[PDB]
């Protein structure tokens, strides 16, 4: 440290720690006297650079501060940075660290502030040279180790980040602001940013998201594509690149409300497309929900290869996975045109092959019955629905149904729902139609109507490839003028096709849903069906639905139930979009009534989805307001008010649910809670309001996909035994279902205690019984999620009928609706060319460790489990493929996706 | 971006939750005013 | 001069502070929103007419400052 002169080269370094003699006196004097001596300075630049490098190792603040103190002055005091024009410009390389030594190494508040501004200007001017890039680089990849650079290099990088962010907030931009003093754009800093990005991508990760999003343009993202696609395999593997990308969309997913969010995720899709794996491509294309992006990946395998190859099989698998059936319709018919084989290809895309694999899983799952043996009165009705609820999905319980004794003892609305429950035994199955047919041609109209509902449920697993579509059966019934018959028919058609908006299905539903002049309560199903059809894909926000809602309000207000169902139907219709839904909020609000205000708060949730924090706060001010106005005064109306209050509560929960899914998974723990206080609250907000918030909570959890499933449903449940409306229990169980018999051991006991214990009304008893059977599926047959499963950010289309029903007080009429509850997840199996129905091995992981994702890419250690197991729910969801040791390579990466495994054995 | 994504969701939700419960403290006592409010008076006098 | 009692101001006070609080919390989400929000306004209208979108606020002031009652 101490000066020991020029005795050897080692002690020259020690000499310049206190006072440099080759950077301070000599150089300073030289610059301030002769200008022939500019030639001597130029040679001495190289020497000066070396002395910095050697003393980088030294970290002490005092011996960088004082040493380079008079050089820091010289910039404006003696040199003035223009006494020899080029020469000070190219000698700004040693002087730039001198400024940083007062910024970061020494902290003097007055100078630390002031010289930040100076650093920005000189960074820009020296990046013209392109040597400011090289200045950054020697510290980014390092040459020496010291604590100092670890705080310092960031400051250089921060100059760029500063200005670019400021141009959005303050419209004036450029160097007009004195907060940077550097121009925002122009060909002098733009080339600096590109070069900087290159070095920082290789070694770091830091400044790359700040730059793209701060420009605010998709253009920034499209520059990124170029650099990364080079890097895809030689620099590092495909996998490392995928983890590098998906996050541009994810940190900044929640962080894109509609117009930006779509434009950024377009680019990520394209990056994946460019790279080797098309498997990553399909996942992002589904995400966007655009028809256009789906087609391009499907075409990419199908069209170029003339031969059948792997390519046709692979295309069919990829589109099959979404059980919305949106991909299914689009992908069909290309197979027909090409014509290698119609028979294998068409079946494989359709959900017909999913019926067959279910038999293999079922061969394992068998049957254990537990259904209620109660008969007579309302207890007969309870038991007969319960049988269907335990045998959801493909199950064989034919003989019990064929005993027509208990069937005929149902009465009223009970008959309709009894036949509907029979259909859920043969849910997702071609056979089952036979049982329904018997009743349909005999007795009163009530059994005829219930048959049509059951056809709907059964037709879910078979409606593609022109193999017994739901359309075929149900068209005749729509024609028939009876209201019960027609209403039942169009409900079942919507369920079966789900998100598919095929020409025949859509166009049948197109002239209708436009009569509401005639007062019919069960014409809720008119719009309700059409709304269900629309979800799963981008929405036209159809003019048929918007018109009829307004017309209904004009005609009637007597049937409170009718207008409440209608309001929800609009909000569910708009799901699958958010850009266009900003427009329609205004359109609805054009005509103003207090009744119309009820509709608006619902539609606000969908428009504002993919952010909600302006939405959240809004849906809370609303809650306060009823109380606020009566509150204010001391210091026909019935229908309008009630619609008003209820809509808001539903809207609050809905807003939260879509928001929690798409974006960061940690926050989910709290979002359930935004409700616990919401509930305590409403249970608190009005006497009337308490009734609504109870029911909403259960579907909050199911939609939101809470991590915790043990504590919160059970605890809430106890309080709500005392409280009226036993429909609370039904909504809790749809969440609790999980992976069956993990969560659900506690659930059956807890729900069973209140139900068995208390009988004081057979009406109250009925709701409790149905909820219990729903929760469990024998021998872990299937799971239900609201989510797609293909994306865990995703949201289904079949589960939207579940979400609808919790907005109203319980009714016998509502029981008919509740039979439908579709939303199946398939169990993965390793496929072959002969369609092998067994998985070899898999790893399951309860909790992803990887803090290189939210989703957590499944690691490679895992816990090993056997063949032919259901894809586990929460606390099992990350799933890695074990097959690599046995000479097998997955073709279709599976992370705990719905998607069936496919392997190529070598 | 990989830490941030986690943070952005989870923080904003803990800030809202906290705020929610402040407005809500008052709101607990509102669905009653003699239905439970009265009950509370009766228990207390007994206790002293 | 008049005597009165007012007890309804406990409700006014309570929501005033509620609406104030929610904005502070929003601070982190909101930065990310602002960038996307602006182009929407440029395209459509500012708040109820196109007119005067060039500043964030161009109109400030107050219409009275004058008050001395009796002399």
A515 Cβ partners below 8 Å, 6+ apart?
A523, A526, A548
Phi/psi at A319 (nearest 5 deg)? -70, -35
Q: Which residues of B touch A665 (CB under 8 A)?
A: 6, 9
- Is residue A890 within 8 A of residue A902, CB to CB? The reply is yes
A398 Cβ partners below 8 Å, 6+ apart?
A435
| Residue A115: Cβ within 10 Å count | 18
**For chain B, which residues lie within 8 Å of any Cβ of chain C, measuring from their own Cβ?**
8, 11-12, 15-16, 19, 22-23, 26
Residue with tokens 């109209």: A445
Q: Which residues of C touch B15 (CB under 8 A)?
A: 25
Beta-carbon separation of B16 and C25 below 8 A: yes
Q: Check if A658 contacts B (Cβ < 8 Å).
A: no
A517 Cβ partners below 8 Å, 6+ apart?
A551, A555
Furthest C-alpha separation in chain B = 60
Helix orientation angle between A238-251 and B4-27, rounded to the nearest 10 degrees? 30
Using a 10 angstrom Cβ sphere, with 0-12 exposed, 13-18 middle and 19 or more buried, the burial of residue A633 is: exposed
CA distances from A573 to A495, A568, A581 (A): 14, 9, 10
Beta-carbon separation of C25 and B19 below 8 A: yes
Report the C-alpha gap between C71 and C67 in whole angstroms: 11
Beta-carbon separation of C30 and A613 below 8 A: yes
Q: Which residues of A touch C16 (CB under 8 A)?
A: none
The partner residue sitting opposite A216, judged by closest CB among C8, C35, C56, is C35
Report the C-alpha gap between A644 and A602 in whole angstroms: 11
Beta-carbon separation of C18 and B23 below 8 A: yes
Report the C-alpha gap between A904 and A887 in whole angstroms: 9
Report the C-alpha gap between A159 and A151 in whole angstroms: 14
Beta-carbon separation of A259 and C19 below 8 A: no
User: Within 13 Å and on the Cβ side, how many CA atoms surround A827?
Assistant: 25
The partner residue sitting opposite B2, judged by closest CB among A678, A689, A853, is A853
Phi/psi at A881 (nearest 5 deg)? -100, 130
Pair of tokens at residue A39: 């030639």
Beta-carbon separation of A250 and B31 below 8 A: no
Report the C-alpha gap between A879 and A864 in whole angstroms: 10
Specified resolution (Å): 4.5
Report the C-alpha gap between A617 and B12 in whole angstroms: 12
Test mutation, C26, C35, C57, chain A, max A CBs within 10 A: C35
Strand partners, C11: none
Report the C-alpha gap between A342 and A335 in whole angstroms: 7
Helix orientation angle between A470-479 and A445-458, rounded to the nearest 10 degrees? 150
First to last CA, chain C: 20
Instruction: Look at residues A101, A142, A122 and name the one whose alpha carbon lies nearest to residue A192.
Output: A122
Beta-carbon separation of C11 and A631 below 8 A: yes
Helix orientation angle between A131-140 and A190-203, rounded to the nearest 10 degrees? 20
Q: Which residues of A touch B29 (CB under 8 A)?
A: 684
Helix orientation angle between A208-215 and A218-230, rounded to the nearest 10 degrees? 150
Test mutation, A635, A659, A674, A685, chain C, max C CBs within 10 A: A635
CA distances from C52 to A166, C46, C47, C56, C59 (A): 22, 7, 9, 9, 9
Report the C-alpha gap between B31 and A681 in whole angstroms: 9
Beta-carbon separation of A664 and B6 below 8 A: yes
Report the C-alpha gap between A117 and A103 in whole angstroms: 11
The chain A residue lying nearest B32, using CA atoms, is A687
Pairing of strands A888-890, A903-905: antiparallel
Q: Which residues of B touch C23 (CB under 8 A)?
A: none
- Is residue A269 within 8 A of residue A284, CB to CB? The reply is yes
Q: Which residues of A touch C34 (CB under 8 A)?
A: 168-169
Beta-carbon separation of B8 and C28 below 8 A: yes
The chain B residue lying nearest A255, using CA atoms, is B8
The partner residue sitting opposite C28, judged by closest CB among B12, B22, B26, is B12
Pair of tokens at residue A856: 């957590």
Using a 10 angstrom Cβ sphere, with 0-12 exposed, 13-18 middle and 19 or more buried, the burial of residue A50 is: exposed
Q: Where are the alpha helices (DSSP H) in A611-704?
A: 615-633, 637-662, 668-685, 689-704
- Is residue A560 within 8 A of residue A522, CB to CB? The reply is no
Which region, left, alpha or beta, applies to residue A856 given φ > 0 means left and ψ of -120 to 50 means alpha? left
The chain C residue lying nearest B9, using CA atoms, is C29
Q: Check if C11 contacts A (Cβ < 8 Å).
A: yes
Beta-carbon separation of C19 and A621 below 8 A: yes
Q: Check if C10 contacts B (Cβ < 8 Å).
A: no
User: Within 13 Å and on the Cβ side, how many CA atoms surround A450?
Assistant: 33
A868 Cβ partners below 8 Å, 6+ apart?
A360, A361, A364, A827, A829, A838, A839
User: Within 13 Å and on the Cβ side, how many CA atoms surround C47?
Assistant: 6
The chain B residue lying nearest C10, using CA atoms, is B26
Q: Check if C12 contacts A (Cβ < 8 Å).
A: yes
> How many residues would you count in chain A?
906
Pair of tokens at residue A808: 């109203």
A729 Cβ partners below 8 Å, 6+ apart?
A717, A720, A751, A754, A767, A768, A771
Q: Check if C29 contacts B (Cβ < 8 Å).
A: yes
Beta-carbon separation of B17 and A670 below 8 A: yes
Q: Which residues of B touch A678 (CB under 8 A)?
A: 20
C14 min Cα distance to partner chain B (Å): 7
What SS3 class is residue A192? helix
What SS3 class is residue C12? helix
Report the C-alpha gap between B17 and B22 in whole angstroms: 9
C5 min Cα distance to partner chain B (Å): 22
Instruction: Look at residues A841, A870, A845, A866 and name the one whose alpha carbon lies nearest to residue A857.
Output: A845
**For chain A, which residues lie within 8 Å of any Cβ of chain C, measuring from their own Cβ?**
168-169, 171, 213, 216, 252, 254-260, 582, 611, 613-614, 616-617, 620-621, 624-625, 627-628, 631-635
Q: Which residues of B touch C26 (CB under 8 A)?
A: 12
Instruction: Look at residues A50, A200, A188, A203 and name the one whose alpha carbon lies nearest to residue A128.
Output: A188
What SS3 class is residue A826? coil
Which region, left, alpha or beta, applies to residue A887 given φ > 0 means left and ψ of -120 to 50 means alpha? left
Report the C-alpha gap between A730 and A716 in whole angstroms: 13
Write out the E strands in A344-486. none
First to last CA, chain B: 59
Q: Which residues of A touch B11 (CB under 8 A)?
A: 667
Pair of tokens at residue A49: 């650079």
The partner residue sitting opposite A628, judged by closest CB among C11, C22, C32, is C11
B17 min Cα distance to partner chain C (Å): 10
Give the H or E element holding residue A888: strand A888-890
């Amino acid at each position: 440290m101490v000066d020991e002169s020029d005795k050897k080269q080692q002690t020259i370094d020690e000499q310049s720690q206190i006072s440099p003699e080759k950077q301070t006196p000599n150089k300073k004097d030289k610059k301030k006297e002769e200008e022939e001596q500019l030639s001597e300075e130029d040679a001495k630049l190289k020497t000066d650079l070396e002395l910095l490098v050697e003393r980088l190792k030294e970290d002490d603040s005092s011996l960088y501060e004082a040493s380079l103190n008079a050089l820091k002055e010289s910039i404006k005091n003696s040199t003035s940075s223009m006494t020899a024009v080029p020469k000070p410009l190219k000698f700004l390389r040693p002087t730039y660290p001198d400024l940083c030594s007062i910024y970061d190494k020494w902290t003097d508040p007055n100078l630390k502030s002031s010289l930040a501004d100076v650093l920005s200007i000189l960074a820009m001017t020296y990046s013209e040279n392109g040597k400011h890039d090289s200045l950054r680089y020697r510290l980014l990849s390092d040459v020496s180790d010291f604590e100092g650079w670890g705080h310092e290099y960031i400051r250089h990088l921060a100059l760029e980040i500063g200005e670019v962010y400021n141009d959005q907030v303050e419209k004036d931009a450029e160097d007009e602001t004195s907060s940077d003093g550097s121009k925002s754009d122009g060909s002098a800093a733009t080339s600096g940013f590109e070069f900087s990005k290159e070095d920082t991508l290789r070694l770091c990760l830091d400044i790359v998201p700040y730059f793209l999003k701060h420009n605010g343009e998709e253009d920034a993202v499209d520059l990124l594509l170029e650099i990364e696609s080079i890097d895809k395999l030689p620099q590092f593997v495909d996998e490392n690149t995928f983890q590098r990308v998906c996050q541009y969309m994810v940190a900044c997913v929640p962080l894109l409300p509609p117009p930006e969010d779509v434009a950024f995720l377009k680019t990520a899709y394209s990056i994946y497309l460019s790279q080797n794996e098309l498997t990553d491509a399909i996942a992002l294309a589904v995400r966007l929900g655009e028809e256009d992006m789906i087609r391009s990946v499907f075409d990419a395998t199908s069209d170029p290869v003339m031969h059948k190859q792997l390519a046709y099989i692979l295309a069919a698998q990829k589109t099959s996975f979404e059980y919305e059936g949106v991909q299914d319709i689009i992908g069909n018919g290309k197979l027909s045109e090409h014509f290698l084989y119609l028979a294998k290809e068409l079946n494989l895309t359709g959900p017909k092959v999913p019926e067959d694999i279910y038999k293999s899983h079922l061969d394992n799952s068998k049957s254990v019955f537990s259904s209620a043996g109660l008969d007579s009165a309302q207890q007969n009705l309870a038991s007969s629905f319960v049988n269907g609820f335990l045998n959801l999905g493909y199950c064989n319980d034919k003989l019990i149904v064929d005993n027509d004794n208990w069937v005929y003892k149902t009465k009223g609305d009970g008959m309709t729902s009894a036949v509907a429950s029979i259909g859920s035994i043969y849910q997702w199955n071609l056979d089952g139609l036979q049982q329904l047919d018997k009743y349909l041609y005999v007795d009163e109209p009530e059994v005829k109507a219930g048959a049509l509902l059951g056809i709907g449920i059964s037709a879910s697993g078979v409606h593609d490839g022109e193999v017994e579509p739901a359309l075929l059966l149900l068209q005749d019934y729509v024609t028939n003028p009876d209201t019960k018959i027609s209403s039942a028919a169009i409900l079942g058609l919507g369920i079966a096709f789900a998100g598919s908006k095929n020409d025949e299905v859509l166009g049948l539903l197109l002239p209708i849903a436009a009569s509401t002049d005639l007062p019919i309560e069960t014409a809720a199903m008119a719009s309700l069906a059409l709304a269900h059809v629309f979800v799963g894909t981008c929405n036209g926000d159809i003019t048929t639905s918007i018109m009829d809602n307004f017309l209904e309000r004009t005609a009637i207000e007597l049937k409170t139930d009718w207008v409440r169902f209608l309001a929800l139907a609009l909000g569910i219709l708009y799901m699958g979009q958010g850009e266009q839904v900003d427009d329609v909020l205004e359109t609805i609000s054009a005509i103003e009534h207090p009744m119309t205000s009820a509709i608006e708060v619902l539609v606000g949730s969908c428009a504002y989805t993919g952010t909600g924090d302006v939405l959240l706060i809004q849906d809370l001010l609303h809650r306060l307001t009823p109380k606020n106005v009566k509150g204010e005064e001391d210091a026909e109306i019935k229908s309008e008010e009630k619609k008003g209050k209820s809509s808001d509560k539903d809207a609050t929960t809905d807003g939260k649910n879509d928001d929690e899914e798409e974006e960061k998974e940690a926050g989910i723990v709290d979002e359930l809670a935004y409700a616990v206080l919401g509930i305590a609250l409403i249970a608190l907000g009005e006497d009337i309001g308490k009734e609504m918030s109870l029911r909403h909570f259960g579907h909050l959890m199911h939609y939101g996909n809470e991590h915790i499933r043990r504590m919160v449903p059970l605890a809430m449940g106890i309080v709500s035994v005392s409280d009226p409306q036993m429909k609370v229990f039904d909504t809790l169980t749809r969440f609790s279902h999980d992976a069956d018999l993990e969560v659900s051991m506690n659930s059956i006991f807890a729900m069973g205690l209140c139900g068995a214990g208390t009988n004081n009304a057979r009406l109250a008893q009925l709701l409790r019984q149905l909820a219990s059977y729903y929760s469990r599926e024998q021998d872990a047959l299937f799971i239900t999620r609201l989510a797609q499963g293909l994306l865990h950010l995703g949201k289904g289309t079949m589960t939207m009928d579940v979400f609808n029903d919790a907005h109203v007080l319980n009714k016998v009429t509502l029981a008919s609706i509740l039979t439908t509850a579709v939303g199946l997840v398939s169990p993965s199996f390793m496929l072959k060319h002969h369609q092998l129905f067994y998985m070899l091995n898999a790893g399951i992981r309860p909790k992803f460790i990887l803090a290189l994702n939210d989703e957590g890419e499944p690691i490679k250690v895992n816990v090993r489990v056997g063949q032919a197991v259901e894809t586990v729910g929460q606390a099992g969801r990350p799933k890695k493929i074990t097959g690599w040791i046995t000479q097998s390579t997955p073709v279709l990466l599976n992370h705990g996706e719905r998607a069936e495994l496919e392997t190529d054995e070598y | 971006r990989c830490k941030l994504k986690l943070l952005r969701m989870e923080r904003i939700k803990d800030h809202l939750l906290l705020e929610e419960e402040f407005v809500s403290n008052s709101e607990i006592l509102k669905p009653f005013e003699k239905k439970q409010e009265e009950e509370k008076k009766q228990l207390e006098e007994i206790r002293g | 001069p008049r005597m009165y009692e007012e007890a309804s101001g406990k409700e006014v006070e309570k929501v005033a502070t509620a609406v104030l609080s929610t904005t502070a919390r929003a601070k982190a989400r909101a930065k990310k929103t602002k960038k996307e929000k602006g182009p929407n306004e440029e395209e459509k209208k500012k708040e109820h007419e196109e007119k005067e979108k060039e500043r964030e606020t161009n109109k400030k002031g107050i219409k009275e400052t004058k008050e001395n009652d009796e002399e």
